[PDB]
C-alpha cells in the first residue's frame, strides 16, 4: 500500500489546468519542506496541508519525479515520528487537531514542524528551532542562498553552491545555536536536501542542474511552480549528495550547551554507515516516541516500519524495535 514507481516517468508539464497555484485559505498548513508545500499549493497534495503517506508518495512522484525508494524512506520516516499512526494522517507543518486525537505521551504527533524528529538545524531557508521559528521562509537566509549562487554558481544554484552553502549554515549554527545538533538522521537529510533544488526544481526540458533565482524564490518562498514548469525527465532524489558531503567534510556532532562547542559524536552514523542511520532511526528515535505501545499502536508501528524498510539502502537488514 506504499505506491509503486510511476508507470510513465517522462518529463511533462506539471503546472497544468488540473494543478493551478492558489493562495492560502484560513487554516491551510505549510511547513519546512518547500517540495511538499508546493505540491499542496498546486493541489497535488490536499491544499489544507494534511495528507496520508500514500498521498505524499503519489504527489512527490507525480509532481516532481521524486524516486520511489527515496519517497518511501522519507514519507514513512516522517509519518512514524510526526504523523498519527491510527488515522494515517500527517501535517506537512504545525501540529493540528485535524490529524486526530493527541496521542498519549511521549508520542508528539507534531507534524513536520516538530523539531528533532525529522526537521532539524542548518536548513538553507528556515531558521533553527532554538531561535523560535523552524518553518517559515527567512529572507536573510534566502539572500545568502542568492549570494552563494552568485559567488559559486554564476548566479544559479548548483551542486557547487550546495557544497559551500551547506558548510556556511553548519558554521552559522555552531557559532550561534547552543543546542545545535548534527548527528544521525539530520546529518543525512541536511546534505541530501541541498541537492533537491538542482535535481528537482530545474525544469525537466533542461535538467542541467542549474537553478535560476526566480524559480528558487517561487518554490522556497511562495510554494509555486514556475509558469509552464515541467517536472524532471526521470525519477531522482539526492543525486550528487557525495559532492556536497566532500566539499567541506564534517564529522557528525553537536554543540554541548554553549556556542562554538561542536563535539564529535562517535556513536553517530555518517555517509559510510547508512544501515546504522536506519537502525538508530527505528531503534532509538521511533522507539523513544513509542517505548511500550498498546496492541493497536504496535500493529500500526510494525506496518509503517515494514513500509519504511522498503525504502532503505540496498543491503541493510531489517531492524525490529517491537520484535516479530
Ligand X SMILES: *[C@@H]1O[C@H](CO)[C@@H](O[C@@H]2O[C@H](CO)[C@@H](O)[C@H](O)[C@H]2NC(C)=O)[C@H](O)[C@H]1NC(C)=O
Ligand Y SMILES: *[C@@H]1O[C@H](CO)[C@@H](O[C@@H]2O[C@H](CO)[C@@H](O[C@@H]3O[C@H](CO[C@H]4O[C@H](CO[C@H]5O[C@H](CO)[C@@H](O)[C@H](O)[C@@H]5O)[C@@H](O)[C@H](O[C@H]5O[C@H](CO)[C@@H](O)[C@H](O)[C@@H]5O)[C@@H]4O)[C@@H](O)[C@H](O[C@H]4O[C@H](CO[C@H]5O[C@H](CO)[C@@H](O)[C@H](O)[C@@H]5O)[C@@H](O)[C@H](O)[C@@H]4O[C@H]4O[C@H](CO)[C@@H](O)[C@H](O)[C@@H]4O)[C@@H]3O)[C@H](O)[C@H]2NC(C)=O)[C@H](O)[C@H]1NC(C)=O
Ligand Z SMILES: *[C@@H]1O[C@H](CO)[C@@H](O[C@@H]2O[C@H](CO)[C@@H](O[C@@H]3O[C@H](CO)[C@@H](O)[C@H](O)[C@@H]3O)[C@H](O)[C@H]2NC(C)=O)[C@H](O)[C@H]1NC(C)=O
Site residues (CB under 6 A) for ligand Y? Answer: 279, 283, 287, 319, 321-323
The contact mask relative to ligand HEM for 184-213 (x = CB under 6 A, - = no) is: -----x---x--xx--x-------------
Beta carbon of residue 149, minimum distance to ligand HEM (angstroms, whole number): 14
For residues 231 and 280, which CB has a smaller minimum distance to ligand Y in the complex?
280
Name residues contacting ligand NAG, limited to 11-40 (CB under 6 A): 12
Beta carbon of residue 144, minimum distance to Mg ion (angstroms, whole number): 15
**Nearest-angstrom CA–CA distance, 131 and 176:** 9
141 is a contact residue toward ligand Z (CB under 6 A): yes
Distances in Å between the alpha carbon of 31 and those of 38, 44, 112, 137, 266?
10, 16, 7, 9, 32
What order of strands is seen across the sheet that includes strand 253-254?
181-182, 253-254, 263-264
Give the one residue of 62, 67, 88, 164 binding Cl ion; rule: CB under 5 A: 67
Name residues contacting Cl ion, limited to 230-269 (CB under 5 A): 235
Give the one residue of 32, 35, 110, 127 binding ligand Z; rule: CB under 6 A: 127
Beta carbon of residue 139, minimum distance to ligand HEM (angstroms, whole number): 12
CB 238 within 8 A of CB 209: no
Q: Are strands 253-254 and 90-91 parallel, antiparallel or unpaired?
A: unpaired
In the block, cell 562547542 appears at 261
Q: Are strands 181-182 and 90-91 parallel, antiparallel or unpaired?
A: unpaired
**Nearest-angstrom CA–CA distance, 227 and 207:** 16
Please name every residue paired with 230 in a beta bridge, in sequence order, or none if there are none: 13
Residue 158 binding target from ligand X, ligand NAG, ligand HEM, none, CB below 5 to 8 Å by type: ligand X
Residue 33 annotated in ligand binding: yes
SS (H, E, C) 24-82: CCCCCCCCCCHHHHHHHHCCCCCCCCEECHHHHHHHHHHHHCECHHHHHHHHHHHHHHH
**Nearest-angstrom CA–CA distance, 282 and 287:** 6
Beta carbon of residue 197, minimum distance to Mg ion (angstroms, whole number): 15
The stretch among 4-12, 25-33, 194-202, 297-305 that binds ligand NAG (CB under 6 A) is 4-12
Beta carbon of residue 94, minimum distance to ligand Z (angstroms, whole number): 17
232 is a contact residue toward ligand HEM (CB under 6 A): no
Name residues contacting ligand HEM, limited to 136-155 (CB under 6 A): none
CB 177 within 8 A of CB 130: yes
Residue 140 binding target from Mg ion, ligand Z, ligand HEM, none, CB below 5 to 8 Å by type: ligand Z
What are the residues binding ligand NAG (CB under 6 A)? Answer: 8, 10, 12
What are the residues binding ligand Z (CB under 6 A)? Answer: 127, 131, 138, 140-141
Binding residues for heme: 33
Amino acid at each position: 500500500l506504499p505506491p509503486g514507481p510511476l508507470e510513465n516517468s517522462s518529463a511533462k508539464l506539471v503546472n497544468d489546468e488540473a494543478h493551478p497555484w492558489k493562495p492560502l485559505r484560513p487554516g491551510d498548513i505549510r511547513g519546512p519542506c518547500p517540495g511538499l508545500n508546493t505540491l499542496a499549493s498546486h493541489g497535488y497534495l490536499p491544499r489544507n496541508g494534511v495528507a496520508t503517506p500514500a498521498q505524499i508518495i503519489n504527489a512527490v512522484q507525480e509532481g516532481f519525479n521524486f524516486d520511489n525508494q527515496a519517497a518511501i524512506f522519507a514519507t514513512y520516516a516522517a509519518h512514524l515520528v510526526d504523523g498519527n499512526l491510527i488515522t494515517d494522517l500527517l501535517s506537512i507543518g504545525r501540529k493540528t487537531r485535524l490529524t486526530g486525537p493527541d496521542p498519549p505521551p511521549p508520542a508528539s504527533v507534531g507534524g513536520l514542524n516538530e523539531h528533532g524528529t525529522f526537521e532539524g538545524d542548518a536548513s538553507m531557508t528556515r531558521g533553527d528551532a532554538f531561535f523560535g521559528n523552524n518553518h517559515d521562509f527567512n529572507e536573510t537566509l534566502f539572500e545568502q542562498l542568492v549570494d552563494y549562487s552568485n559567488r559559486f554558481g554564476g548566479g544559479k544554484y548548483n551542486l557547487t553552491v550546495a557544497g559551500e552553502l551547506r558548510f556556511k549554515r553548519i558554521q552559522d549554527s555552531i557559532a550561534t545555536n547552543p543546542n545545535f545538533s548534527f548527528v544521525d538522521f539530520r546529518f543525512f537529510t541536511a546534505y541530501g536536501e541541498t541537492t533537491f533544488p538542482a535535481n528537482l526544481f530545474v525544469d525537466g526540458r533542461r535538467d542541467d542542474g542549474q537553478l535560476d533565482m526566480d524559480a528558487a524564490r517561487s518554490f522556497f518562498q511562495f510554494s509555486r511552480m514556475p509558469d509552464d514548469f515541467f517536472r524532471a525527465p526521470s525519477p531522482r532524489s539526492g543525486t550528487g549528495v557525495e559532492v556536497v558531503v566532500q566539499a567541506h567534510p564534517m564529522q557528525p556532532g553537536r554543540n554541548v550547551g554553549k556556542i562554538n562547542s561542536y563535539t564529535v559524536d562517535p556513536t553517530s552514523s555518517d555517509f559510510s554507515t547508512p544501515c546504522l542511520m536506519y537502525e538508530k532511526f527505528v531503534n532509538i528515535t521511533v522507539k523513544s516516541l513509542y517505548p511500550n505501545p498498546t496492541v493497536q499502536l504496535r500493529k500500526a508501528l510494525n506496518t509503517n516500519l515494514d513500509f519504511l524498510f522498503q525504502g532503505v539502502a540496498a543491503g541493510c537488514t531489517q531492524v525490529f524495535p517491537y520484535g516479530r
